[PDB]
Amino acid sequence: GLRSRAWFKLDEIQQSDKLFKPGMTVVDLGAAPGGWSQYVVTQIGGKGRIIACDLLPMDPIVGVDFLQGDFRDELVMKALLERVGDSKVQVVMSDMAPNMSGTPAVDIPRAMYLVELALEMCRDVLAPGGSFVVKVFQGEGFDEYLREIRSLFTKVKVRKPDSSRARSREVYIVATGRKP
Numbered sequence: 001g002l003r004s005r006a007w008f009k010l011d012e013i014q015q016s017d018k019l020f021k022p023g024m025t026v027v028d029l030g031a032a033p034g035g036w037s038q039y040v041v042t043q044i045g046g047k048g049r050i051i052a053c054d055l056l057p058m059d060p061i062v063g064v065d066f067l068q069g070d071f072r073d074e075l076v077m078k079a080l081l082e083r084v085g086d087s088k089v090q091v092v093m094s095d096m097a098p099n100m101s102g103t104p105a106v107d108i109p110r111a112m113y114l115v116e117l118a119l120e121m122c123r124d125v126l127a128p129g130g131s132f133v134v135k136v137f138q139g140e141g142f143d144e145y146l147r148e149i150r151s152l153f154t155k156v157k158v159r160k161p162d163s164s165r166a167r168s169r170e171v172y173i174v175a176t177g178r179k180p
């Protein structure tokens with residue numbers, strides 16, 4: 001196809017939630033191979049920019065500062081913050097998901113650790129009034145994580161893009177209006 005399933009899931013979210021606007025600065029976590037950043041550049045235009053990260057390498061994209069490393073490493077955080085600088089960040093987006101073993105009592109804790117890391121970076125860099133979109137799986141830990149996001153944002157929706165496989169346990173929490 002011309003674009004990946006991931007690209008289509010974000011297009012569906014932009015259609016439903018209107019997160020991306022011209023000139024915004026966006027953080028893209030678990031960016032490889034680049035669908036979400038490629039999509040966001042079409043919305044933020046050439047004057048916006050993205051600071052992206054993945055364990056895997058990916059093709060460069062004009063307007064995207066891409067750092068390849070393990071987001072679980074405190075060091076990689078430091079380097080990502082170096083690319084953000086004093087730019088205000090209007091959206092933090094995360095599509096990170098772990099290598100899955102196939103056993104939920106193992107895969108869910110691995111996945112929840114990454115979205116907890118994504119929320120901690122959101123707390124640290126997202127500007128007041130900003131948005132956070134994160135891939136999360138149904139199951140253990142989902143209720144508490146959603147409650148925490150609801151306490152930090154003015155509006156929160158749980159989206160299941162039509163492009164998301166019906167068999168997949170994933171959903172996307174879409175939060176807008178980061179509270180003061």
Ligand SMILES: C[S@@+](CC[C@H](N)C(=O)[O-])C[C@H]1O[C@@H](n2cnc3c(N)ncnc32)[C@H](O)[C@@H]1O
Nearest residue numbers: 006030032033034035036054055071095096097
């Ligand atoms: C569903 S894919 C991302 C697809 C991407 N949104 C796109 O549009 O191409 C999930 C990504 O999370 C990344 N990931 C998982 N654990 C990570 C970690 N510790 N640090 C950085 N990226 C991680 C993976 O390497 C994988 O590329």
Ligand SMILES: [Hg+2]
Nearest residue numbers: 053067068069
């Ligand atoms: Hg990275």
Ligand SMILES: [Hg+2]
Nearest residue numbers: 122123126152
């Ligand atoms: Hg936040």
